[PDB]
Design a protein around this ligand. Structure first.
Ligand SMILES: COc1ccc(Nc2nc(N3CC[C@H](NC(=O)c4ccc(C(=O)O)cc4)C3)nc3scnc23)cc1OC
Length: 267
């Protein structure tokens, strides 16, 4: 898990920054091959990066960004496998030609990764289109585990600036974060994807979003988004935690609809 700084070569330019730290492109000499990497570079900030690394170490799924390891040099560094195409929202903003079938493919991949995360009893707590990274146009991975929590053996939730527009009502009202709250976030992520990376709740303050949702109102159907996918969004935005679907149910719906669209394409 502990990497050798002299086997790591970093670029001068920066890729971008998340909630904390800064990410640069790099190259790491493995056992034989050289691997292209994305490297998060920086007392509280040190522990946050190590907690993020601790979460990633425990995860093993094709639809989740893999950690290569950590290194304490100029600063603490978190070395991850590179996803070359970057954040999903930014990609779709630059590529409006991307077909509806392709969007379904990508959000289904996210649902598979989240089904695994749910099974593993980890809550992501920051699921948004910005935190889905593209390996290719047809391969998405979940990233940015800086706010993620391993659930206690005896509880199905974690009790806690917040990304309010992605948060379920129980997160706001009770500070409770579960796989179900991740499902709510996933609904917002779906809306973002089908809106080609547009920000949700445009022009609204966090408090106004909370007020809107309390009234039972939800964001409208994005232009060109299939009704079946908008229906799934709304299901993810079920106010009641118990009645809201888990990721097993969400993944199955997406899987089945994706196959329907693949079938229509062949006809
Ligand atoms: C195409 O450019 C790219 C190519 C590869 C990558 N690749 C990668 N970037 C990042 N970071 C994690 C932290 C950085 N966040 C933002 O830059 C950002 C973006 C958008 C919003 C918003 O809309 O709110 C917020 C934050 C990006 N992490 C990993 S892990 C494996 N690959 C990457 C990134 C590119 O862009 C950063």
């Amino acid at each position: 898990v502990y990497l050798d700084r002299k086997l790591l070569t970093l670029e001068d330019k920066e890729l971008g920054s998340g909630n904390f730290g800064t990410v640069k492109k790099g190259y790491y000499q493995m056992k034989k091959v050289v691997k292209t990497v994305a490297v998060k570079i920086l007392p509280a900030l040190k522990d946050e990066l190590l907690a993020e690394a601790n979460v990633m170490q425990q995860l093993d799924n094709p639809y989740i960004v893999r950690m290569i390891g950590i290194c304490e040099a100029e600063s603490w560094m978190l070395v991850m496998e590179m996803a070359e195409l970057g954040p999903l929202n930014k990609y779709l903003q630059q590529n409006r030609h991307v077909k509806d079938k392709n969007i379904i493919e990508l959000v289904h991949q996210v649902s598979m990764g989240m089904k695994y995360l749910e099974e593993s009893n980890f809550v992501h707590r920051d699921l948004a289109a910005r935190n889905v990274l593209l390996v290719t146009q047809h391969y998405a991975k979940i990233s940015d585990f800086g706010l993620s929590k391993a659930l206690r053996a005896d509880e199905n939730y974690y009790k806690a600036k917040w990304p309010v527009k992605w948060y379920a009502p129980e997160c706001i009202n009770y500070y409770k974060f579960s796989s179900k709250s991740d499902v709510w976030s996933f609904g917002v992520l779906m809306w973002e994807a089908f809106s080609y990376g547009q920000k949700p709740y445009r022009g609204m303050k966090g408090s106004e979003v909370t007020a809107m949702l309390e009234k039972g109102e939800r964001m409208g159907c994005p232009a060109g988004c299939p009704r079946e996918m908008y229906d799934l969004m709304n299901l993810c935005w079920t106010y009641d935690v118990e009645n809201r679907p888990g990721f097993a149910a969400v993944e199955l719906r997406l899987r089945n609809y994706y196959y329907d669209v693949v079938n229509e394409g062949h006809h």
